[PDB]
Amino acid sequence: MSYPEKFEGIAIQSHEDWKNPKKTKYDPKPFYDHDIDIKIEACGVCGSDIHCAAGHWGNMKMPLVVGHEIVGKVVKLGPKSNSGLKVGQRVGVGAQVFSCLECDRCKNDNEPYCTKFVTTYSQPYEDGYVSQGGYANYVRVHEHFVVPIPENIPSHLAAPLLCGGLTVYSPLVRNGCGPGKKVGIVGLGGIGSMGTLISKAMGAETYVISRSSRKREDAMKMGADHYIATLEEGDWGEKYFDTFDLIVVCASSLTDIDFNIMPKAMKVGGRIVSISIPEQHEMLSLKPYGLKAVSISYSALGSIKELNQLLKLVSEKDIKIWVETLPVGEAGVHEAFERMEKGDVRYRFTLVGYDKEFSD
Amino acid sequence: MSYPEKFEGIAIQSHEDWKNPKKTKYDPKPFYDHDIDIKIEACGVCGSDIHCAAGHWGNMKMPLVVGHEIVGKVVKLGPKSNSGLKVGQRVGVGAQVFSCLECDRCKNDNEPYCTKFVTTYSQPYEDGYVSQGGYANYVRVHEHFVVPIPENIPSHLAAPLLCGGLTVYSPLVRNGCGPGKKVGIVGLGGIGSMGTLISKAMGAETYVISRSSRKREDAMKMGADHYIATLEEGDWGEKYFDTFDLIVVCASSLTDIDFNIMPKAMKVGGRIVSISIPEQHEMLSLKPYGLKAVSISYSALGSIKELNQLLKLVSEKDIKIWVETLPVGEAGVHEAFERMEKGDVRYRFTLVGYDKEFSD
Ligand SMILES: NC(=O)c1ccc[n+]([C@@H]2O[C@H](COP(=O)([O-])OP(=O)(O)OC[C@H]3O[C@@H](n4cnc5c(N)ncnc54)[C@H](OP(=O)(O)O)[C@@H]3O)[C@@H](O)[C@H]2O)c1
Ligand SMILES: NC(=O)c1ccc[n+]([C@@H]2O[C@H](COP(=O)([O-])OP(=O)(O)OC[C@H]3O[C@@H](n4cnc5c(N)ncnc54)[C@H](OP(=O)(O)O)[C@@H]3O)[C@@H](O)[C@H]2O)c1
Ligand SMILES: [Zn+2]
Ligand SMILES: [Zn+2]
Ligand SMILES: [Zn+2]
Ligand SMILES: [Zn+2]
């Protein structure tokens, strides 16, 4: 029906026909004192959307609206709400939609690693409602995770940062990525493109690292102080031996990723940090011997504290990420859900045209 | 014959009868301007001695004197020598006997990770001589790796530190192990006992972590602020969830070591650092998923810069490690080479009685 009660968006009808989302109307999550209702106007098509919609992450309950790089307008604060959010204000939610905010971790800015963590979609809340939102009219989120968007940042250009940008940002800041450091980005995909700008933005000699040579022109436009083509090396770890401090692996999969060479190109004390979560069958397989004064580990999202620093950073030195917009609705989604599985994107797909698409 | 030319020690005759070393006389490494000749008087029986003597590390060339926790008297500096070493002075060599000292790594205190690295024994130098020393009268080492021993530190009690102590020390200091930190030591063996004292010594709430409950009394004498028995837990990672910053795995093998539970007991940003090098068949096998904001990596020896800080530290707050001396010579070695493979040691075996054993 209408906003008060029923919500509407483009939802996956089943993993089988996942490439065919349909306009749907569903029941919103029950409202709570800190919750907030945001009318969406721009969501970013993230690689994670594709995996879930497909089913690489187990069978998800359908219907199921996807999308978690949300940017919209505030349209209803909650009783005990409070944080500075004016109604009708421009905000944005990312991949985390809940946390308990009391454990040492939450209180210490590590909400992604909280025991009570709940992602923006396909996960039921402690009350049983399976999160939704993203490719729909509005989203209902707990005010702690809804952030403010600087004005000098376009909506279609901000959304991608709520997840993809934050995800690369977090391990970069946390691992000392600034003047003097040699940072390598592995996989110039969506998050890979942002990781290179953000890396440069923080003033760190950035090295983009892909397989083919196809993306050399782009990676070079982005600011990459050097590029590397895996296929044209036979063993790059030996050539770039002892060079990097940090390396962030941003790859949809982890098969065409050799983890027994990489360690060589690391400084003693270097750090290989992966961001991926592939088909629930894969594994990070690498010979143990090679982690000689070189560590490996995985990282999830980032703290809403950081999601801000990022936005602040982009806003300041004006970071122009690479986004190609689409018409929200059964069509635009399909295309995105098509071209993403073809790597056929100028890195980030940002659905827009939310307005002339749903109507009350 | 005599010191000038021929050297003498107890050498493995073959991997087969490795439990039966024999008194032997062998050709020393050619002398060089920075080299030094040290008359040994106390070597520490390290777990690595056993693996090599046995053959877990491929077939080594025999004869082969083993032992690399050496403490002795200076008996002949080299032409271009220089560093402050007085002849007849008390010094000690560890596991590294060579490095190129010019690369960024050497110049930056990471000699263990140097490309030209050479260990104290079983490795030929760039000139072809296969390092020896340890369970013998004297050892010929490049002055950069021969360190000074504080007087208030007994010889039989210092030797163990040259390798075992340094090996635990390095990752502790490098990873911030001091006031406020929760450090866990996994495997109260030789290096495990030292890791607990050194850990406490640096004022860090130390947690010894073994399988059985056998070593609770000792680990508790050492100062361990808490002990944990793997076998009496079923899943300790869940009980000690989110507790440690650092964990140093000091285990001869890596089989009875489950690496899919550990990560749970780590703080976000914690670090699991292994020190082991088992049979050349084993591997560090652990589910990839669990390294969520938790890294794993391996570490080798330590920089001679640190091998000093350690000695300084022990000397200062007087660190009494657990050593049980033995009579150098075909016998004492045998015993050590026996009890070590039975974990039948009060942690460290230090051969002594070098004097009334070889003679000129
Ligand atoms: N931990 C977190 O918080 C978090 C948050 C969001 C997403 N993720 C994960 O991030 C990934 C999606 O990132 P994205 O949206 O930026 O990616 P994407 O745009 O979907 O592109 C994937 C990129 O990874 C590389 N790639 C694809 N197939 C590969 C294969 N078989 N082997 C090696 N590399 C391959 C490609 O790089 P080149 O061809 O240039 O080498 C490609 O550009 C997913 O795995 C998702 O689950 C994690
Ligand atoms: N990287 C380096 O620089 C370096 C230098 C020297 C030595 N090392 C390595 O350090 C080890 C020797 O250390 P060490 O001399 O102190 O040891 P050790 O005295 O020989 O005792 C080994 C200890 O490890 C644990 N252990 C034995 N078998 C095990 C198994 N199957 N599974 C799990 N844990 C097991 C035991 O602890 P609990 O029974 O109490 O649990 C035991 O006390 C070797 O692996 C050697 O190659 C590395
Ligand atoms: Zn995402
Ligand atoms: Zn929490
Ligand atoms: Zn050793
Ligand atoms: Zn060097």
UniProtKB/Swiss-Prot annotation, chains A, B:
GO cellular-component term (any): cytoplasm
Listed GO biological process terms: alcohol metabolic process; aldehyde metabolic process; furaldehyde metabolic process
GO-annotated molecular function: 3-methylbutanal reductase (NADPH) activity; alcohol dehydrogenase (NADP+) activity; cinnamyl-alcohol dehydrogenase activity; hydroxymethylfurfural reductase (NADH) activity; hydroxymethylfurfural reductase (NADPH) activity; zinc ion binding
Database matches in CDD domains: CAD1
EC number(s) recorded for this UniProt protein: 1.1.1.2, 1.6.-.-
Cofactor note: Binds 2 Zn(2+) ions per subunit.
Something else known: Present with 21700 molecules/cell in log phase SD medium.
This protein's encoding gene: ADH6
Protein name stated in the entry: NADP-dependent alcohol dehydrogenase 6
Gene3D superfamilies from the UniProt entry: Medium-chain alcohol dehydrogenases, catalytic domain, NAD(P)-binding Rossmann-like Domain
